[PDB]
Amino acid sequence: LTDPIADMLTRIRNATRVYKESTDVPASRFKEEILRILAREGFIKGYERVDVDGKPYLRVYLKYGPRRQGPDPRPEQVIHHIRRISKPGRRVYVGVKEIPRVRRGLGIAILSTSKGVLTDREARKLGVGGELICEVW
Amino acid sequence: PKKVLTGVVVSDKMQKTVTVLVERQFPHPLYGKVIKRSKKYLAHDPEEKYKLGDVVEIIESRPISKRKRFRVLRLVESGRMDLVEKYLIRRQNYESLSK
Amino acid sequence: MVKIRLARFGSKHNPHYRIVVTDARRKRDGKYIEKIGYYDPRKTTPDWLKVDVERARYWLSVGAQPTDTARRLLRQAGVFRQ
Amino acid sequence: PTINQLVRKGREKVRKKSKVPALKGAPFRRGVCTVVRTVTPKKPNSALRKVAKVRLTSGYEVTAYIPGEGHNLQEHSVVLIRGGRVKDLPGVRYHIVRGVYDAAGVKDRKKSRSKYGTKKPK
Amino acid sequence: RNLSALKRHRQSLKRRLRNKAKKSAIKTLSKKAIQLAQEGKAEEALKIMRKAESLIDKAAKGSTLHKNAAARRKSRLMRKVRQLLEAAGAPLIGGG
Amino acid sequence: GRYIGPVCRLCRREGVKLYLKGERCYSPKCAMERRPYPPGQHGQKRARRPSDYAVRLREKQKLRRIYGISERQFRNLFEEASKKKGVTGSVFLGLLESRLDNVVYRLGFAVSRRQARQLVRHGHITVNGRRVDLPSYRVRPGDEIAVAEKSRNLELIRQNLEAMKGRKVGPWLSLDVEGMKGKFLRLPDREDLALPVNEQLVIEFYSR
RNA sequence: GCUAAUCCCCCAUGUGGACCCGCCCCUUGGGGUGUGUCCAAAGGGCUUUGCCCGCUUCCGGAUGGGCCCGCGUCCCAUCAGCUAGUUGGUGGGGUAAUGGCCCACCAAGGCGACGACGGGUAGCCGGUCUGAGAGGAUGGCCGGCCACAGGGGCACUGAGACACGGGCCCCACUCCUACGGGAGGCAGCAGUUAGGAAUCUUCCGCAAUGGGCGCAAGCCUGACGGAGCGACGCCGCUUGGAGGAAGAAGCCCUUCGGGGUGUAAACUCCUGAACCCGGGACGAAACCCCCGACGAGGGGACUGACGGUACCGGGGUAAUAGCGCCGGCCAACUCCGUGCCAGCAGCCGCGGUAAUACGGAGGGCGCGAGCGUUACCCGGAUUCACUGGGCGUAAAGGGCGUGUAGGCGGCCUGGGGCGUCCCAUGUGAAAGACCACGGCUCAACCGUGGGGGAGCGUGGGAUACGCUCAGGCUAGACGG
RNA sequence: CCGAGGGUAGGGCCCGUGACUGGGGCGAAGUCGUAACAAGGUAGCUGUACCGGAAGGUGCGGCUGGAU
Ligand code: SF4
Ligand SMILES: [Mg+2]
Ligand SMILES: [Mg+2]
Ligand SMILES: [Mg+2]
Ligand SMILES: [Mg+2]
Ligand SMILES: [Mg+2]
Ligand SMILES: [Mg+2]
Ligand SMILES: [Mg+2]
Ligand SMILES: [Mg+2]
Ligand SMILES: [Mg+2]
Ligand SMILES: [Mg+2]
Ligand SMILES: [Mg+2]
Ligand SMILES: [Mg+2]
Ligand SMILES: [Mg+2]
Ligand SMILES: [Mg+2]
Ligand SMILES: [Mg+2]
Ligand SMILES: [Mg+2]
Ligand SMILES: [Mg+2]
Ligand SMILES: [Mg+2]
Ligand SMILES: [Mg+2]
Ligand SMILES: [Mg+2]
Ligand SMILES: [Mg+2]
Ligand SMILES: [Mg+2]
Ligand SMILES: [Mg+2]
Ligand SMILES: [Mg+2]
Ligand SMILES: [Mg+2]
Ligand SMILES: [Mg+2]
Ligand SMILES: [Mg+2]
Ligand SMILES: [Mg+2]
Ligand SMILES: [Mg+2]
Ligand SMILES: [Mg+2]
Ligand SMILES: [Mg+2]
Ligand SMILES: [Mg+2]
Ligand SMILES: [Mg+2]
Ligand SMILES: [Mg+2]
Ligand SMILES: [Mg+2]
Ligand SMILES: [Mg+2]
Ligand SMILES: [Mg+2]
Ligand SMILES: [Mg+2]
Ligand SMILES: [Mg+2]
Ligand SMILES: [Mg+2]
Ligand SMILES: [Mg+2]
Ligand SMILES: [Mg+2]
Ligand SMILES: [Mg+2]
Ligand SMILES: [Mg+2]
Ligand SMILES: [Mg+2]
Ligand SMILES: [Mg+2]
Ligand SMILES: [Mg+2]
Ligand SMILES: [Mg+2]
Ligand SMILES: [Mg+2]
Ligand SMILES: [Mg+2]
Ligand SMILES: [Mg+2]
Ligand SMILES: [Mg+2]
Ligand SMILES: [Mg+2]
Ligand SMILES: [Mg+2]
Ligand SMILES: [Mg+2]
Ligand SMILES: [Mg+2]
Ligand SMILES: [Mg+2]
Ligand SMILES: [Mg+2]
Ligand SMILES: [Mg+2]
Ligand SMILES: [Mg+2]
Ligand SMILES: [Mg+2]
Ligand SMILES: [Mg+2]
Ligand SMILES: [Mg+2]
Ligand SMILES: [Mg+2]
Ligand SMILES: [Mg+2]
Ligand SMILES: [Mg+2]
Ligand SMILES: [Mg+2]
Ligand SMILES: [Mg+2]
Ligand SMILES: [Mg+2]
Ligand SMILES: [Mg+2]
Ligand SMILES: [Mg+2]
């Protein structure tokens, strides 16, 4: 497996699209810190470190909207959109002045900085940049 | 300051001179990705103390000969023949790129 | 010598000099060492003269040589007052 | 392509192919006429289009259109040419400028006169 | 068809003479002393070597030698003579 | 220079009265009053649906035709507005307004801007004292726009000065008859003018 | 053959400076010291036992340079191998100085898919143009650097040149002549000719700014300041304004009733470009002269090419409009003529007897001392796609493996801090652009202030992620 | 000694041109047939090979992107 991060986000995107309550992703002290942001900002209900066949995972509790009126009652997503920015194929790094404004404020950019994993908003606050991990809304 | 660079010695076959290979990374000015580029410097070694495989630092210096404008600053590591392999094997592949 | 003099900017029938320190061997309107003030000979504004005085005294100490018609605009700003 | 591939091979800026080579980068070029005759257009048109073969200051010899109704061009007629093909006469890629050198303006143009080198009337 | 550039060429020819003549001598002497110093013959080497050094610095007064040339010619002159007398010694005058 | 020809055909093509003459503009001898249909052979033919392009051309031309201004000069202002802070549409109208010849006609010294030019051009107008004969002078707030002294005694300006005694002048302007002098107070809010122009459609013309 | 000097030389003098050897600090040849040796000079002038300008050796400043190094700098791989002064060494030559820059000897090295070598094209930058940006294209004018001076080579003089209007030599070409012999180098300003689609006056002045020489007066300055030509560009301005018929003539259309041109014209009145007359600049206050001290400081005067021009005043004439287009894209429609002809055309397409598409006409649309065409650049073109595309059938998966370089890589802990991120600081010239203001009656143009930046150097910090080193693990992989 | 260049000799790359010749594009108002598109009247296409005025044919093997 070549990108653990991209893998996680996709495990999520894929599940959210058939409306699973949760999904398991292989555990990591870096992936968690990202989940810590996904939950805090209310994209997920949250996560808990579980175990499958002796091996550490992160069970991720997914969140959606109301049932709907019309022929397609499938609720709206909370995570409509999540995608790698930086990648192993091309590391993407921004300085503070060039951190993007996701979706006109309504979305976030998680980034990894030397002050930990932050959002665009938070990064601007401590005034640091870093590897732009991804974008969510 | 006098520019200082670090690299592997790939040749000791000159008298009082070593070929030191210095490597560097930088993002592609358009495609972003971090890319490596390398370069050989003829470094002055009056003492013939530097061996093949040494990792060393070299400091820009007043010109010693045509092409030699660096003296060897100091030893850093010894016995990196694995680096020397990477270079030597690459040159050996060149016999296979011709016609 | 290095010189203090008058580089003409502005335009036709509309002079506007920059009193400036430059090498004598430069062309008039060429790269100068340092700007130190300006001078509107047509006097068309309230300060048709400005001169950093603190600076012009330095260059003189260090050997700069002003032109005649620059020596004056240094008198008029009293760079010379003893 | 992958990003690495692009680092490796780059993208290719595609060059343009001039459509008026005989001009050798000039706005116009002077010439002399060799053959001055009529040509028949391709389907679906039918006519007798007026054409001059012109030998250039730029080394080249080309067929150029003679616009207007009627002309005074014959062998040895000196002529200035401009660019622009005539879609229906393949190989013709240039126009003779009326009103220049031995190419007379059109007798009795009233409309669009500048394009035909016809002076203003009384 | 005229100029005082002519004048300036007229002069260069004359300065050229005085220069070349001066430089000739320096080499004649330096080599003379170096020759002596080889077969040294120490007093004489040193004697001529002084006559050189004098003439060198004399040349450095004007356009003939830039000061650093004079320095350099002197430096190499002396080094040669001394190290030559090392193959037999010993310094009979000055110097030094 | 500027348009300088039959000026009633302008209104008829525009489908609206533009007050390009002055007096006869208010009479029933006005062209729009008699033939409120486009000049020339086909004016009475049933108009067919104008295209979008068509529409924005007219709104632009109409605004332009009002000021008697050349298309370049019009452009250069607009572009100026596009670089200048704020809502371009407002600022554009504002800058169109600050033209000497317009200011003069707004302060009533003339019956038509077309007459307000020849006044400025013939130096009968001045600003802050000094004479100005430039129909394009960009008037700023605070300026005193007066009739020339040597022109105060003139038949036509008299007749025209007599006509303003109590007709009220826009909120951005003050006027002192007898003193023959007016004053430029501020740039017009859009409401301060009510020209038959959706100025937005003008922006839309220049973004193609 | 003779004669002068700030020309040349000789000795003396030594603050100093140079050089060899030793020593101390440093640390590439930096600073000091001891012995030895070696090197200075030119006087002119006035108000004349005192000034001024020169002359000499040294130190430091300033300014301008040389050399060196990191990174950046186009097309072709149908150019894949290149290299003998080649790569390094030792000694020496040379220079201001390092260096194969040059030589002698020794060693066998140096370079190249990260694209050497070769071919092609190009002076590079500040900038410019376009573009939402990213990018693309470009390097004219202005500023910075480089290179060159008919084509080559060379050195001399000199602080500095291997010297555009200096020298030597060879070549090509032209000219002069008295036919023996000589001359020249506009890629300085104008100007001629050739070439070309095409690009200026053999003008004026040193008044201003600047430069050279001079104690200074001052002399020279095709730098420059201005004037001339050209709609080449941008900016400004004019050919008028108001009033004026249910609306002439003419011309165009028509259902023959009328509709259009058109308030357009006439005509009436108001203004007043041009043109006349008078006056008339800013740019110029220094240098010098005065007293003071030849300084600080205060007064004297000279001087303007542009130019009797701008501009101010007074008088005063209604006074140039053209060009493209009107099938769709695209804003603008009818009549005649023509009849797959003559012709139009950017693409699609028009024309074969009722053509809004040809030609004329009336009318209309668009711009206006301009309009249009041709050429070229970016745009639309996410149609080379980083931003921002694609590959079952549209163009596009290698015939399949194996595998070199490379690119990329699981979980946990530490060390380092290369990428990365932050702070400080230097640099990031001037002009241009951007925001403010201000001067030419506006503008264009121009001036004063402001705002920054990427990117590189330096110092300090952070350590999530990528890297690197080190120690663990078993979910990948491999083995039993 | 080196040295502009000149001379002798042999090489490499590129441009122009050349009796004649090979196909190609186009035009179109012709001659000859009718190979493909329908089961296109022998399913088609295919690499290769031999052959025929010409499209083409046949052999071998492959593909369906073949009608019934
Ligand atoms: S009369 Fe006044 S308003 Fe009516 S048309 Fe003529 S100008 Fe326009
Ligand atoms: Mg991206
Ligand atoms: Mg060496
Ligand atoms: Mg046809
Ligand atoms: Mg010819
Ligand atoms: Mg036409
Ligand atoms: Mg002289
Ligand atoms: Mg001799
Ligand atoms: Mg000297
Ligand atoms: Mg010399
Ligand atoms: Mg104009
Ligand atoms: Mg609309
Ligand atoms: Mg705006
Ligand atoms: Mg109105
Ligand atoms: Mg109104
Ligand atoms: Mg636009
Ligand atoms: Mg004598
Ligand atoms: Mg002496
Ligand atoms: Mg050798
Ligand atoms: Mg050496
Ligand atoms: Mg030298
Ligand atoms: Mg060499
Ligand atoms: Mg490399
Ligand atoms: Mg390549
Ligand atoms: Mg070439
Ligand atoms: Mg070139
Ligand atoms: Mg774009
Ligand atoms: Mg270029
Ligand atoms: Mg150019
Ligand atoms: Mg330049
Ligand atoms: Mg040359
Ligand atoms: Mg030469
Ligand atoms: Mg020449
Ligand atoms: Mg020559
Ligand atoms: Mg010279
Ligand atoms: Mg020369
Ligand atoms: Mg040179
Ligand atoms: Mg020169
Ligand atoms: Mg010359
Ligand atoms: Mg004779
Ligand atoms: Mg002779
Ligand atoms: Mg001559
Ligand atoms: Mg010609
Ligand atoms: Mg000329
Ligand atoms: Mg000129
Ligand atoms: Mg002068
Ligand atoms: Mg002067
Ligand atoms: Mg002097
Ligand atoms: Mg002159
Ligand atoms: Mg009627
Ligand atoms: Mg009527
Ligand atoms: Mg009529
Ligand atoms: Mg009628
Ligand atoms: Mg009228
Ligand atoms: Mg004056
Ligand atoms: Mg048009
Ligand atoms: Mg259009
Ligand atoms: Mg239309
Ligand atoms: Mg006919
Ligand atoms: Mg007809
Ligand atoms: Mg048309
Ligand atoms: Mg027509
Ligand atoms: Mg568009
Ligand atoms: Mg693009
Ligand atoms: Mg294009
Ligand atoms: Mg992409
Ligand atoms: Mg596509
Ligand atoms: Mg296909
Ligand atoms: Mg396959
Ligand atoms: Mg194969
Ligand atoms: Mg590998
Ligand atoms: Mg790796």
Ligand SMILES: [Mg+2]
């Ligand atoms: Mg990892």
Ligand SMILES: [Mg+2]
């Ligand atoms: Mg680590």
Ligand SMILES: [Mg+2]
């Ligand atoms: Mg770091």
Ligand SMILES: [Mg+2]
């Ligand atoms: Mg910075």
Ligand SMILES: [Mg+2]
């Ligand atoms: Mg700047």
Ligand SMILES: [Mg+2]
């Ligand atoms: Mg102003």
Ligand SMILES: [Mg+2]
């Ligand atoms: Mg500025």
Ligand SMILES: [Mg+2]
């Ligand atoms: Mg900016």
Ligand SMILES: [Mg+2]
């Ligand atoms: Mg760490």
Ligand SMILES: [Mg+2]
């Ligand atoms: Mg490990």
Ligand SMILES: [Mg+2]
């Ligand atoms: Mg396993």
Ligand SMILES: [Mg+2]
């Ligand atoms: Mg030779």
Ligand SMILES: [Mg+2]
């Ligand atoms: Mg030769």
Ligand SMILES: [Mg+2]
């Ligand atoms: Mg010869």
Ligand SMILES: [Mg+2]
């Ligand atoms: Mg042929």
Ligand SMILES: [Mg+2]
């Ligand atoms: Mg043939």
